[PDB]
Design an enzyme around this catalytic site. Structure first.
Site, PDB file in Angstrom:
ATOM      1  N   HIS A  87       0.918  -1.258  -0.145  1.00  0.00           N
ATOM      2  CA  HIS A  87       0.197  -0.007  -0.039  1.00  0.00           C
ATOM      3  C   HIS A  87       1.023   1.188   0.127  1.00  0.00           C
ATOM      4  O   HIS A  87       0.511   2.305   0.175  1.00  0.00           O
ATOM      5  CB  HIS A  87      -0.893   0.122   1.333  1.00  0.00           C
ATOM      6  CG  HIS A  87      -0.265   0.153   2.639  1.00  0.00           C
ATOM      7  ND1 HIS A  87      -0.790  -0.220   3.761  1.00  0.00           N
ATOM      8  CD2 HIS A  87       1.063   0.672   2.789  1.00  0.00           C
ATOM      9  CE1 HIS A  87       0.023   0.106   4.756  1.00  0.00           C
ATOM     10  NE2 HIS A  87       1.171   0.902   4.145  1.00  0.00           N
ATOM     11  N   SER A  88       2.038   1.050  -0.223  1.00  0.00           N
ATOM     12  CA  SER A  88       2.985   2.284  -0.060  1.00  0.00           C
ATOM     13  C   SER A  88       2.870   3.411  -1.187  1.00  0.00           C
ATOM     14  O   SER A  88       2.760   3.213  -2.309  1.00  0.00           O
ATOM     15  CB  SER A  88       4.498   1.681  -0.303  1.00  0.00           C
ATOM     16  OG  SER A  88       5.348   2.732  -0.344  1.00  0.00           O
ATOM     17  N   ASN A  89       2.772   4.466  -0.626  1.00  0.00           N
ATOM     18  CA  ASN A  89       2.317   5.909  -1.240  1.00  0.00           C
ATOM     19  C   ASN A  89       3.956   6.086  -1.869  1.00  0.00           C
ATOM     20  O   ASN A  89       4.044   6.583  -3.059  1.00  0.00           O
ATOM     21  CB  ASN A  89       1.936   6.891  -0.334  1.00  0.00           C
ATOM     22  CG  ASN A  89       0.616   6.624   0.148  1.00  0.00           C
ATOM     23  OD1 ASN A  89      -0.244   6.265  -0.684  1.00  0.00           O
ATOM     24  ND2 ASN A  89       0.354   7.041   1.437  1.00  0.00           N
ATOM     25  N   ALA A 146       6.313   4.178  -2.735  1.00  0.00           N
ATOM     26  CA  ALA A 146       6.702   3.445  -3.704  1.00  0.00           C
ATOM     27  C   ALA A 146       6.261   3.856  -5.033  1.00  0.00           C
ATOM     28  O   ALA A 146       7.068   3.876  -6.044  1.00  0.00           O
ATOM     29  CB  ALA A 146       6.421   2.063  -3.394  1.00  0.00           C
TER      30      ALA A 146
END
Ligand SMILES: *Cc1c(COP(=O)(O)O)cnc(C)c1O
Ligand SMILES: *Cc1c(COP(=O)(O)O)cnc(C)c1O
Lengths: 325, 325
Positions: free
Chosen positions: A80-82, A84
């Site tokens: 769910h990395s913003n 990344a």
């Protein structure tokens, strides 16, 4: 832009991703309720991809990558990395290639979905820690530089020293645009990188303003230690001194990623009362920490909240939020 | 803000939702490819909820609702409706109540999910048309005014006459902020309301600029007819004359909602080349229409694209997009 912060950042290269100053607004309804004036700086409107705080860091992180002639950017995070996603998007926008090293359920949602839609190279591992993956990236990197290619690896949340200059700059922007004498500036704390920049920035302007972080996950040990390590490293980059102590409270609700009805309740509140959309993993908890501290008369009269984005997490963890409201 | 458009809008009431001018950017990579200069006005950054064009309309639509003392706002759309969500959010923000009358699969995704998270009252019907629902709303309204309550009903996409003033104002903003002599302004066309405002606006400034609409669904019959009906009605509100003919091309790809690999391809392109996220139902097709027209040397040298939001549709119809890339 403050002349001082301007001169101190003058010799640093950066790619200009954000072409404007994000706005600051007063929050009438929230302010009436908590008994304190709360303003919000809209870094959720930074413009690239899903916006947010990481865009300010990438201007320097990517400036640094181009300077070393990198042809492939690699970084990590949860699925769910913003960080990344926008890292991948900004790198492709600059003609670079990107490999995202994630961890978590491979569900087609949130930023993960966005990753696939944009065709960003995704490599999911069984790891547990965000720094655990750091070695897997250093695997894909250390080797990928065999097919000639040069790799540029970015730490979790862009928590690198030059990355931090992103929010030193933000403080400069805020100094020149706002006409408000702030008592404290509340920001969520993941890697502590954003908080670090705000701290050093206020320190550089010698502002008697309290930089307040809200840890949304593992409080601190090697975290509370890298924070200070981050502040002094970037401060050495600016050849400057560091005013001791950025405040940090815990509102992680037990663990990073943990979603609760109180966090869900704040998301609905700020949404229907100020028309602003917060997120379950970062801003929602951070803002929860805001309302808590504020009501306990511990943040002062005038509070500036930094909106660091994360709208993807609200689409991602949407149902977990419903089932709590 | 142009003095003229300023004086013409002076006597109209509005709720101020957008506290700033949305930025305009040049698109280097896209511009290099299509052989024309293309700029983008960021109305996806209008700030309330998911942002977008409908926020400009709501400032007037809600100003009008407050003026009549309405206590409940009702509007309609598909389940993925951007208009419905932000209408509900803005109304609750202003202490009003809202009932969203939708149609479509009741899946917890996109704006529908957002509707539930914010606790906006949702009523889904078996209807097929967006104006078909108009009678169901007029049902919930015409009656709800029995429990004392006063209802305010908003047409599809805010395609009301005062709603249209939202983009008359936008033209004023654009006139004063940009330092570019535009040849045409390309915008997606759903209800034609946004296009109507831009047209009347350019007409009022007597700008030799071509307002170009890109119909993303049912081209025109009663649509191409309400467009003109919309333009003259709002122009009567401004006590002004109307320069004849806003251009309108069809890039609906057959039907409203139809998602294609070419639309999916444009979403990935603009995303990885300009770091900007378009959507499957509106902007993606509209921008597709941009690149097409442009390459055929039919839009001129300097083109201003209005980004009207819709990021929710990219999370909503995300997998249909993947399965096409
Ligand atoms: C990454 C992120 C943060 C945390 O930033 P740090 O620099 O790691 O403190 C906060 N909010 C959002 C929305 C984020 O994506
Ligand atoms: C509603 C909408 C449109 C269309 O607006 P009209 O005023 O109906 O032409 C275009 N783009 C997006 C993202 C929208 O939500």
């Amino acid at each position: 832009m403050h002349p001082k912060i301007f001169a101190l950042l003058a010799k640093f290269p950066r790619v200009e991703l954000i072409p404007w100053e994000t706005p600051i607004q007063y929050l009438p309804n929230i302010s009436r309720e908590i008994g304190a004036d709360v303003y919000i700086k809209r870094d959720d409107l930074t413009g690239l991809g899903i916006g947010g705080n990481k865009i300010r860091k990438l201007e320097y992180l990517l400036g640094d990558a181009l300077s070393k002639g990198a042809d492939v950017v690699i970084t990590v995070g949860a699925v769910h990395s913003n960080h990344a996603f926008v890292t991948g998007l900004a790198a492709k926008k600059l003609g670079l290639d990107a490999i995202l090293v994630l961890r978590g359920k491979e569900e087609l949602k949130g930023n993960y979905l966005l990753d696939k839609i944009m065709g960003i190279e995704t490599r999911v591992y069984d790891a547990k820690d965000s720094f655990e993956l750091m070695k897997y990236a250093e695997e894909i990197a250390e080797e990928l530089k065999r097919e000639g290619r040069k790799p540029y690896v970015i730490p979790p949340g862009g928590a690198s020293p030059i990355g931090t200059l992103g929010y030193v700059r933000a403080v400069g922007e805020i100094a020149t645009q706002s006409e408000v004498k702030f008592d404290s500036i509340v920001v969520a704390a993941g890697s502590g990188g954003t908080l670090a920049g705000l701290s050093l920035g206020l320190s550089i302007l010698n502002e008697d303003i309290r930089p307040v972080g809200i840890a949304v996950g593992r409080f601190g040990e090697v975290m509370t230690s890298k924070l200070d390590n981050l502040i002094k490293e970037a401060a050495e980059l600016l050849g400057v001194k560091v005013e001791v102590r950025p405040e940090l409270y815990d509102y992680s609700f037990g663990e990073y990623g943990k979603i609760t009805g109180e966090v869900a309740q704040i998301i609905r509140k700020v949404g229907t009362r100020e028309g602003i959309i917060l997120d379950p993993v970062y801003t929602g908890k951070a803002f929860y920490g805001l309302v808590d501290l504020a009501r306990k008369g511990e943040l002062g009269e005038k509070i500036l909240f930094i909106h660091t984005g994360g709208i993807s997490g609200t689409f991602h963890y949407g149902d977990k939020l419903l089932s709590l409201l």
